[PDB]
Ligand binder design. Structure first.
Ligand SMILES: Cc1c(N)cncc1NC(=O)Cc1cccc(C#N)c1
Ligand SMILES: Cc1c(N)cncc1NC(=O)Cc1cccc(C#N)c1
Lengths: 304, 304
């Protein structure tokens, strides 16, 4: 019992972190096999960030200009290429600590762990969701660029995020491991609009199921609703419309608790319309949307 | 910017986790140098837990009855001893992955990371506080016993907690690494009272400073208070009385923000008396007490 915002164990990712320096800019890199991946803006000075021509900036660089240091050990760079917004530095040594891994592009609303790093050194690990507007509400300071987000399936690390930028609003933007930004963002020092965000409805319902499993049941009521009726309420409260695909992935939690998905929707409808009334659910005074149905099942069954 | 409930990177601790089996009971063990530490209740059956005589139960066990497996590798047990509520199994092989470490007994109100484990395998990492009543509100299932709590100071892991028990209330109890329980608990299947808990005042003030640093400032007011006046409010709202020792450790945050500690106390006084008014602070709709002043400074400066 108990329910926490749990991150994956970060050990497999810690073994991959390196420091990358190009000129006067230092950030983090991810060393997997014989390649180091890092944000391409490592090649920019602060002046370059206003309107960078990355192709021209990279042409002024040679392999020997990319200094890669794995803690104490120096890597020899034998190739460099830019793919979208990431640089791939080929090194002459495969990382002996490379875990089994995949590169995945996650969907908005999915969750992942971030290993925040500075100068190639891990500082902390936290769990977060990719917002529906493709930003993440992380905890990142200058030097955190190159820190990665990931999920783990037994012994396989699926890397899904590389940190690039903090928007003027204090929220964060980054790319998949092929260097494609999540959302409309570009790697430039220009104010950029993140879309209107919404609350991840299926995750709030998953978390209400986690609450019932752990004994927090006060919000359960005598009501039911329909997808159409619930979606009128979701619209009013800026929640994602619930679909049958979301109801389908909530099936295991509905089966475990015996609470039909639309009956849990009626509890969520009442909480949106009435608020919490000064009460808490799983130690929170607001509706939590950073746990997917898969996370709730994993945490409630003890998967390693 | 951004502020998250961040855990320490768990890699150094993952390398120490092993599975310990004695008879039909399996739990987690911590392998440091040539010793494996685990809860002594690994020697009990479910029937034994009602009123165990651990000395007599341990006398029926030999070194060869303790099966220790480090993932895939089997450890040879060459000695066993009970120290308070932990067993120490001497093995013939020093853990090659032993980090620099210390055993510390933390104070109530301090925070630490927990690496939740099952069958010797890490499942997740989360940050929590030791409550003033010496319980922790963790996320633990059957088989999680032996999971540890820790802090990290550069390359040194300070182990402070080993998980032993879930109280009938769903909160958690455990020991330091010398096997002494935190709080009044005993390792027996008997209902046990955890003391009245309080809110960790110095941590709420540290978190209000973290909020101002990150731009959440709506709660700042034109008022000030005294320690005596603030403590009358703390008493009414079940908060720990604030002392000059707490004001002293808040000095770096007061200096960074220019907000005198007693002026922040007046903001906290107004929030206790008026509530949040439907607003949030750092994404929370309640007053958060799981960040110490040291955690806020570490997170706000990027320490690795
Ligand atoms: C300063 C900072 C913080 N606090 C957190 N995270 C990141 C940063 N760094 C930056 O955003 C620096 C920067 C500037 C312009 C474009 C890009 C890109 N791509 C990157
Ligand atoms: C079942 C469980 C969960 N959910 C989380 N954490 C732990 C458990 N295990 C137990 O509490 C089993 C137990 C029983 C009686 C005394 C002691 C001790 N010491 C340990």
């Amino acid at each position: 019992s108990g329910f926490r915002k749990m991150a994956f164990p970060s050990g497999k990712v810690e073994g991959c972190m390196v420091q990358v320096t190009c000129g006067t800019t230092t950030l983090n890199g991810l060393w997997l096999d014989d390649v180091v991946y890092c944000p391409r803006h490592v090649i920019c000075t602060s002046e370059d960030m206003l309107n960078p021509n990355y192709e021209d900036l990279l042409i002024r660089k040679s392999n020997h200009n990319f200094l890669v240091q794995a803690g104490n050990v120096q890597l020899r760079v034998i190739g460099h290429s830019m793919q979208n917004c990431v640089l791939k530095l080929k090194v002459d040594t495969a990382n002996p600590k490379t875990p089994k891994y995949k590169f995945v592009r996650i969907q908005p609303g999915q969750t992942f762990s971030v290993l925040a790093c500075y100068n190639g050194s891990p500082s902390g690990v936290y769990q977060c969701a990719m917002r529906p507007n493709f930003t993440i509400k992380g905890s990142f300071l200058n030097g955190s660029c190159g820190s990665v987000g990931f999920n783990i399936d037994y012994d396989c690390v699926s890397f899904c995020y590389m940190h690039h930028m903090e928007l003027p609003t204090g929220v964060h933007a980054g790319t998949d491991l092929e260097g494609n930004f999540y959302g409309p963002f570009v790697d430039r020092q220009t104010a950029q609009a993140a879309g209107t965000d919404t609350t991840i409805t299926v995750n709030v319902l998953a978390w209400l199921y986690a609450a019932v499993i752990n004994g927090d049941r006060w919000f359960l009521n005598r009501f039911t609703t329909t997808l159409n009726d619930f979606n009128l309420v979701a619209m009013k409260y800026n929640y994602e419309p619930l679909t049958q695909d979301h109801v389908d992935i909530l099936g295991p939690l509905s089966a475990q608790t015996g609470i039909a998905v639309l009956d849990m929707c009626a509890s969520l409808k009442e909480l949106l319309q009435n608020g919490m009334n000064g009460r808490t659910i799983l130690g929170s005074a607001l509706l939590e949307d950073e746990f997917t149905p898969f996370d709730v099942v994993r945490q409630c069954s003890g998967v390693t």
